[PDB]
């Protein structure tokens, strides 16, 4: 007669169970029929950090299926713009043509994909509606004003290294209005595309189309969008007297804060969230009996890091909206019968 | 609208309305698993399970077997609605939290 409703207990030789006991018929009284108000009451979102290119909200009180749906949407279904076709007029570089096209596909563009649309199948030409064109034209020459020196930038250098700065947007249609001068640009100005020697030249036109990270990774808008369940650490016994420090070393260092309540030293669990699961207490043989570390049941921690095309919060919003769009597409196709 | 990027339903042996297999095209484990979680909350369904037919293909099979009365197409169309309601609520809550944090940080 003992219920544990909220934690995923764990030892070393394996974890105890894979359930969450929050579904219909999963208890004598604790049965579920998807009370929507109970959800709307027990749900809360909390954001730990929001630099540019980072977010760490909490998303407390949701199941693993919905959290995983959100994570898989950000990685593979939120749309981005990226180079699909490369027209090469001349290329006397050491970098091949196909390898140059590949390298150009993996460069992130700062166009927001919500103002564009998908190119129809076999729309090779493209129009202001679905495409953005950029041009890289660079040639390397020796600089006339150079002494007998060997630094590659000083001599043998007008364009020794071709960067993303060298790529220039060719406004395709009326896109010069709508897009102000600096808005459509590659996100990073320092990505090394190639290297040149005097007499070598690159000249090409790149076409960027819309797409999702599912049919090619180049179109994916986040470095990673993973999540982790909130750890839980409980001191079953008061640790003290120089075993507190050994305890504080078997964890990521901020988790067990050793206070000094009396002349003796007491270890306390200051911040369970910092913990990385390393299970190094389980090697102690005397303190594996003192601490129980498990996971909180439906308390997640998310971390979204965008490449630079869209801000992270906008990414999460568009992910939730993409899931809603899936649901609505299937609802309206069902209503079609 | 789309004759086959979307739904194809196969009523079972005897065309039992209470046992249907929906084929959802262009879907992977994301919608499959979230929708199966949302359809399991209905006490009127006795068996819900999804599965991907083959890696090379892009389509899932849901199987809903409901109790004696309802035609097993209401559980599906209600799991969809509840999942979309949950997504709308999560979106509202997340945007409100982001706004509140932006204000708290821009003030200080």
């Amino acid at each position: 007669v003992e219920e544990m409703r909220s934690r995923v207990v764990l030892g070393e030789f394996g974890v105890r169970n894979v359930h969450t006991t929050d579904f219909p018929g999963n208890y004598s009284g604790y049965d579920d029929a998807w009370d929507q108000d109970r959800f709307e009451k027990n749900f809360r979102v909390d954001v730990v950090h929001m630099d540019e290119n980072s977010l760490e909200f909490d998303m407390v009180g949701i199941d693993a299926a919905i959290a995983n749906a959100f994570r898989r949407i950000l990685l593979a279904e939120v749309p981005t713009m990226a180079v699909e076709k490369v027209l090469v007029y001349n290329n006397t570089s050491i970098v091949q043509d196909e390898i140059l096209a590949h390298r150009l596909g993996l460069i992130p563009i700062h166009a927001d994909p919500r103002l564009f649309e998908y190119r129809n199948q076999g729309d090779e030409e493209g129009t202001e509606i679905d495409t953005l064109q950029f041009r890289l034209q660079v040639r390397c020459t020796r600089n006339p004003h150079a002494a007998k020196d060997s630094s590659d930038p000083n001599e043998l250098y007008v364009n020794h290294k071709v960067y993303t700065r060298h790529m220039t947007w060719i406004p395709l249609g009326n896109q010069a209005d709508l897009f102000p001068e600096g808005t459509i640009r590659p996100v990073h100005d320092d990505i090394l595309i190639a290297q040149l020697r005097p007499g070598q030249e690159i000249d090409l036109l790149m076409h960027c189309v819309k797409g999702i990270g599912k049919d090619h990774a180049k179109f994916s808008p986040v470095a990673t969008a993973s999540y982790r369940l909130l750890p839980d650490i409980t001191l079953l016994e008061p640790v003290e007297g120089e075993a507190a420090e050994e305890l504080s070393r078997c964890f990521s260092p901020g988790v067990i804060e050793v206070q000094e309540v009396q002349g003796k030293k007491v270890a306390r669990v200051a911040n369970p969230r910092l913990d990385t699961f390393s299970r190094e207490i389980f090697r102690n043989e005397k303190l594996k009996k003192v601490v129980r570390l498990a996971r909180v049941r439906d308390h997640y921690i998310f971390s979204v890091e965008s490449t630079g095309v869209l801000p992270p919060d906008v990414l999460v919003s568009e992910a939730i909206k993409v899931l809603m769009g899936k649901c609505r597409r299937f609802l309206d196709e069902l209503d079609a019968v | 609208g789309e004759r086959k990027t979307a739904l194809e339903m196969v009523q079972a042996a005897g065309t039992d309305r209470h046992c249907v297999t929906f084929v959802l095209h262009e879907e992977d484990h994301t919608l499959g698993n979230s929708l199966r979680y949302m359809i399991m909350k209905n006490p009127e369904v006795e068996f819900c399970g999804y599965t991907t037919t083959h890696p090379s293909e892009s389509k899932i099979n849901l199987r809903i077997q409901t109790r004696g009365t309802l035609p097993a197409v209401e559980p599906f169309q209600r799991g969809l609605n509840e999942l979309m309601n949950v997504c709308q609520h999560v979106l509202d809550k997340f945007e409100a939290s982001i706004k509140d944090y932006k204000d708290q940080k821009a003030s200080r």
Binding site: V48, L274 | K105
Partner: peptide, 5 residues
């Protein structure tokens, strides 16, 4: 580290 203060 710790949701917003």
């Amino acid at each position: 580290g710790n949701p917003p203060v």
